């Protein structure tokens, strides 16, 4: 836990001093009634304020310089995500998932 495992991972120093990762649980999509994607905790990185995306003039391609733009880690528990982020010495913040309040729902309430 306290071990600074980033000294041996080989990742560049910019992951620690310049990038911010978000630990979050995916919110339920408003267009679908499934909840499978909300059962896992994920880690992604905030975009670079400049150079995240720019248009290549030759073909209109989406050019980028962020090498972490397409990396999304998967975790089964919130504690596991925190332990891994702490182990790598990342600057992170946790977005607590919104919980749906339970309200009783019955067919009789359509008239009463």
């Amino acid at each position: 836990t306290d071990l600074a495992k980033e000294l041996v991972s080989g990742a560049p120093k910019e992951l620690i001093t310049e990038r911010v990762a978000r630990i979050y649980q995916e919110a339920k999509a408003a267009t679908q009634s499934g909840q499978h994607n909300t059962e896992t905790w994920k880690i992604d990185w905030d975009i670079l304020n400049k150079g995240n995306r720019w248009e290549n003039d030759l073909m209109g391609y989406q050019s980028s310089s962020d090498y972490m733009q397409g990396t999304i880690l998967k975790f089964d528990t919130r504690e596991g995500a925190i332990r891994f982020a702490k182990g790598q010495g990342w600057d992170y913040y946790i977005q607590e998932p919104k919980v749906r309040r339970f309200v009783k729902k019955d067919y009789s309430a359509n008239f009463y």
């Binding site: 067919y107 009789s108 008239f111």
Partner: protein, 453 residues
């Protein structure tokens, strides 16, 4: 067997109030009302009366579910006075020929159910019956038989007439309430039940005309006499609407458990063309499946004897089919009926009835394959038991009845149809040359049977 419940079934005694009293309709009305619902419920239970609307449910048992009404809260009673079902001609005659008999039954039944009002739901096609029934109701109001003082008794009771505008689905009890409340008239899901939450959010009971009209006699001639007719637990008399391939169709008031063969031969002449010319019989109504000739030879009119043979005694609507008839087209007509009469809220019957109608159209001409007989049978299974109301079940039995006992006759059409076309037909009615060009399917016989229009 004379001295039945109904005596004016032939329009020979008048449709007035006085003749009804001379017929015994309004007799001892004060005493019966003051006997309390405890005795009325027990008599109905002890008379073995069962629901005449099609379900066949104990009338006495379904009246006790109504909660007591000590504070005179507005409970309701609804009379299912619309027919809807093809081949049924019972409710029309009771409303027309004996309008005052039903009105007397509503008050006596209402007293048992603790009902403060009665709503009669009659078809829009029965305008003459509704006008005649309204005339009887208004006379009973002036005579004091209806209102806040029912023949001196303190039981206040009102009667109203609500007219539908044409819907077979409105015959169902929950859909009937929706029509009265001013909605489309789609059946409700069973919980909460109409006994607890019904018309206007009040306790309610929905009963057939043939069930309410028998109540006055049961309260007078005792439940023992009514229970004497029929076999065990099928106790009572029944009005039978007989029509089709018969000599002289009519409506008779025989008793339960009477053999089908004797009933069609004792009166109504006989089968048109003799007994050897009988192809099939559809009792109860269009909902129940058909029965073949040999089965009908020993069929007793009961909610159980007809249940055993694979059929149902819904409304005693007996439809006779001689051998010189199109049996598949007759069943196809039933499928087209339920497609048009489907209210269309649940997925199964909104789609299944259309699915059955499309497949039955190719069967009547033979533009299908023999394996598709099992396909349409499977599609009917996907409808039963997956619907809010029973119209989905009622739309699958006629097709299954055709398959069960008349499958070889359906195969004959397919074999005959291939002779004319030469090459065999593929699934769905497609040939080896049929293709779509410029907005239409060409080079293929299309079954144009969707009522054209």
């Amino acid at each position: 067997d004379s001295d039945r419940i109904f005596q004016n079934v032939y329009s020979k005694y008048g449709e007035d109030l006085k003749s009804s009293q001379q017929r015994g309709d309004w007799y001892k009305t004060k005493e019966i009302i003051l006997k309390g619902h405890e005795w009325l419920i027990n008599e109905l239970k002890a008379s073995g009366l069962r629901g005449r609307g099609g379900a066949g449910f104990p009338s006495g048992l379904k009246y006790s579910f109504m909660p007591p009404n000590p504070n005179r809260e507005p409970q309701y009673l609804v009379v299912n006075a619309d027919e809807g079902e093809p081949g049924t001609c019972k409710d029309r005659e009771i409303i027309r020929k004996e309008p005052h008999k039903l009105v007397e039954g509503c008050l006596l039944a209402g007293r048992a159910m603790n009902a403060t009002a009665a709503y009669i739901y009659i078809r829009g096609e029965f305008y003459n019956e509704a006008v005649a029934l309204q005339t009887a109701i208004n006379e009973a109001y002036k005579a004091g038989l209806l209102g806040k003082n029912a023949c001196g008794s303190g039981y206040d009771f009102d009667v109203y007439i609500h007219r539908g505008m044409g819907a077979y689905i409105c015959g169902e009890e929950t859909a009937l309430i929706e029509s009265i409340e001013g909605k489309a008239g789609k059946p409700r899901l069973k919980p909460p039940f109409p006994a607890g939450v019904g018309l206007f959010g009040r306790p309610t009971t929905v009963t057939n005309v043939e069930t309410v009209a028998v109540t006055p006699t049961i309260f007078r001639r005792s439940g023992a006499w009514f229970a004497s007719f029929g076999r065990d637990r099928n106790q009572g008399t029944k009005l039978f609407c007989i029509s089709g391939h018969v000599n002289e169709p009519c409506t008779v008031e025989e008793s339960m458990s009477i053999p089908l063969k004797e009933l069609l031969e004792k009166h109504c002449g006989g089968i048109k063309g003799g007994w050897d010319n009988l192809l099939g019989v559809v009792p109860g109504g269009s909902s129940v499946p058909i029965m073949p000739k040999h089965v009908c030879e020993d069929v007793l009119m009961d909610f159980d004897a007809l249940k055993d043979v694979g059929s149902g005694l819904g409304t005693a609507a007996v439809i006779v089919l001689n051998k010189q008839t199109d049996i598949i087209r007759a069943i196809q007509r039933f499928s087209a009926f339920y497609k048009h009469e489907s209210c269309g809220q649940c997925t199964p019957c909104r789609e299944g009835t259309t699915y059955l109608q499309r497949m039955m159209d190719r069967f009547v001409t033979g533009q299908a394959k023999e394996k598709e007989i099992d396909l349409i049978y499977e599609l009917s299974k996907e409808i039963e038991g997956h619907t809010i109301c029973a119209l989905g079940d009622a739309a699958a039995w006629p097709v299954q009845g055709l398959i069960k006992s008349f499958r070889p006759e359906m195969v004959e059409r397919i074999k005959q149809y291939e002779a004319k076309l030469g090459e065999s037909v593929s699934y769905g009615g497609w040939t080896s040359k049929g293709k779509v060009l410029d907005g239409k399917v060409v080079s293929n016989p299309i079954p144009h049977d969707a009522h054209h229009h």
